[PDB]
Write a protein that binds this ligand. Structure first.
Ligand SMILES: Cc1cc2nc3c(=O)[nH]c(=O)nc-3n(C[C@H](O)[C@H](O)[C@H](O)COP(=O)(O)O)c2cc1C
Ligand SMILES: Cc1cc2nc3c(=O)[nH]c(=O)nc-3n(C[C@H](O)[C@H](O)[C@H](O)COP(=O)(O)O)c2cc1C
Ligand SMILES: COc1ccc2c(CCc3c(C(=O)O)[nH]c(=O)[nH]c3=O)cccc2c1
Ligand SMILES: COc1ccc2c(CCc3c(C(=O)O)[nH]c(=O)[nH]c3=O)cccc2c1
Lengths: 313, 313
């Protein structure tokens, strides 16, 4: 019985990794993730210039999940590139490097420079599309023409296999259109579903107040709130993008939640809010819980059940 | 102390009602809602002809909420019109009638017939904008040009104050666009936020199966999953539509949940999943719990705290 995967020309001890943005901003964070029993790690989504991000409080968690409007705080691309080229120990586990430029030009500038490091050290690119572009327009992956433009330009500039982090969709027509855009780009080899459920609002009844400062308290939702949404998006893209891998992200707190993602079609499984709350210890627990479920069902490998969710009649 | 209120030229004993689709399909349901302690009731969204809906199982509930792909089963517009015209006791509480035709033409035809009954009896119209659109396009409320057409055509055909039931939005640009559409229409006097969070997927780990039969197990989410989504949409519309009322729907299980909706800007609060699960007794509990929160805070009226959610700095 084993959790091993081989994909994207890399070998992974198990499918678990951090979600971008959690436990991955600083060298200390990245060394912590590397020391953990995760099968991989992803570095904080970065911009060309470092960013302090939004005023605090900008993240809060609760029993059912989390809300955040972090404002993309990060050490800048040069730092994450250095980590990739010089500091990471690839013998421990593979590394993903997430980028999230604020314009298509900023993404192209970063991927051009990433490429030789990707080719030489084998770091894998995750491009974050669940990101702002022009204020007053939708985030990039909610504007299909902007999305196509970003993917054309990054495909040209990078020239190597990469993946994309997608926001959740809620309408079948959007699943259809979004997958068809992705399917234009053969270098897009994996699709991570999903980023936070956008612009929720948490209100504390006692104080009669919102809980985060930016955007009058509106921010992205993660955790138990979003698991069915995340499974829907994993499965929708799994069904529509047969030549791509799907990575699942959203609502994983247990080996059972991981198992559901994998039945929906997930290859790797990312953990955000639960990791933020529990710490990197969570990965040993997740592995143990998922292996217990596999043993009770007689499953020896992940491929025995990946994408095999049953439908009714 | 009592929770009585006046809006849309009607008087309401309290701000609670069922959500469209729950406990409101049949004469028996409507009589049960009428006998409850709710302040108002809304009938099932209807089409010109009766519909059986989708194959079962089509609704399932869990500790954190519900998933449905009902397929709009309903008795037909003639039935709900007759209910509004001849059977409902308006001395007991106000009635809302929800319409959701499969085309603009069908909606116009229904509203032309409802208008004289709205005039004579005071039934209120809730137009459900999660209704199907032309090939390739998302539901009507997600296609702003279609939504503008529907509202123009209904406004002309109906000619009286009405409301609209909205799906959730997840993007601030979308809130801006959607609100500006609604704000073109002076007859749109209330906006209900929100319908179910679209196309989630619930999977049972033991059986490795989805839990509803239609659409390969994909369906709308309600209940605890959606409360922060619901509050964001209530507040976004409350901020953007100063000349309209906002009705909150989503995630209400307690007076505290109702209190949060009202703080976010809700005038009436609709109960869906929790009503389906707990039954019509829930209305007396909700009233008691909301009054108890008011008493502890020193609030004597809903008006004292409606829309008064505090932001940070
Ligand atoms: C504090 C915080 C920061 C995040 N920053 C990023 C980011 O920089 N890039 C990104 O792609 N997603 C970001 N996310 C989203 C997570 O990667 C993840 O998609 C989302 O939280 C859902 O997973 P969960 O339910 O496990 O939290 C962030 C999430 C949190 C909570
Ligand atoms: C079984 C079922 C049937 C529903 N049918 C309708 C409907 O016919 N029209 C409509 O506007 N919303 C319909 N809804 C959506 C609800 O009115 C409500 O907006 C949604 O369930 C979220 O509220 P909740 O969190 O309280 O469930 C339905 C919901 C359920 C669960
Ligand atoms: C104000 O500047 C930004 C920059 C990045 C943002 C992003 C992208 C970064 C990001 C963030 C974040 O940094 O806020 N949070 C997530 O849950 N997922 C993400 O992908 C989302 C929403 C608002 C943003 C505002
Ligand atoms: C052709 O099958 C459909 C399915 C859903 C429909 C709907 C949505 C009805 C609805 C349903 C539903 O009955 O599935 N469930 C919800 O959670 N919200 C709703 O608003 C409106 C108009 C026509 C429709 C036709």
């Amino acid at each position: 019985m084993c959790l091993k995967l081989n994909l994207l020309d890399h070998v992974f001890a198990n499918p678990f990794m951090n979600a971008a943005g959690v436990l991955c901003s600083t060298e200390e964070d990245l060394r912590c993730m590397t020391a953990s029993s995760s099968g991989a790690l992803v570095s904080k989504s970065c911009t060309s210039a470092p960013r302090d991000g939004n005023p605090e409080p900008r993240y809060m968690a609760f029993p059912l999940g989390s809300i955040n409007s972090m404002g993309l705080p990060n050490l800048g691309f040069d730092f994450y590139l250095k980590y990739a080229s010089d500091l990471h120990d690839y013998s421990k586990k593979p590394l993903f490097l997430s980028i999230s430029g604020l314009s298509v030009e900023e993404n192209v500038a970063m991927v051009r420079r990433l490429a030789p490091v990707a080719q030489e050290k084998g770091v894998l690119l995750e491009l974050n599309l669940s990101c702002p572009n022009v204020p007053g327009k939708p985030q990039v992956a909610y504007d299909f023409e902007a999305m196509r433009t970003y993917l054309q330009q990054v495909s040209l500039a990078y020239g190597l296999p990469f993946g994309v982090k997608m926001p959740p969709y809620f309408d079948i027509a959007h699943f259809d259109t979004a997958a068809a855009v992705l399917n234009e780009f053969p270098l897009v080899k994996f699709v991570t579903c999903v980023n936070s459920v956008g612009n929720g609002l948490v209100i504390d009844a006692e104080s009669e107040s919102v809980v985060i400062k930016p955007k009058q308290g509106f921010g992205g939702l993660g955790g138990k709130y979003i698991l069915p949404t995340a499974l829907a998006n994993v499965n929708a893209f799994y069904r529509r993008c047969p030549d791509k891998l799907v990575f699942g992200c959203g609502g994983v707190y247990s080996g059972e939640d991981a198992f559901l993602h994998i039945l929906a079609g997930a290859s790797m499984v990312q953990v955000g809010t639960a990791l933020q709350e529990e710490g990197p210890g969570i990965f040993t627990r997740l592995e143990d819980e998922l292996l217990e479920i596999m043993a009770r069902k007689g499953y020896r490998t992940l491929e025995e059940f990946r994408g095999r969710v049953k439908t009714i009649e």
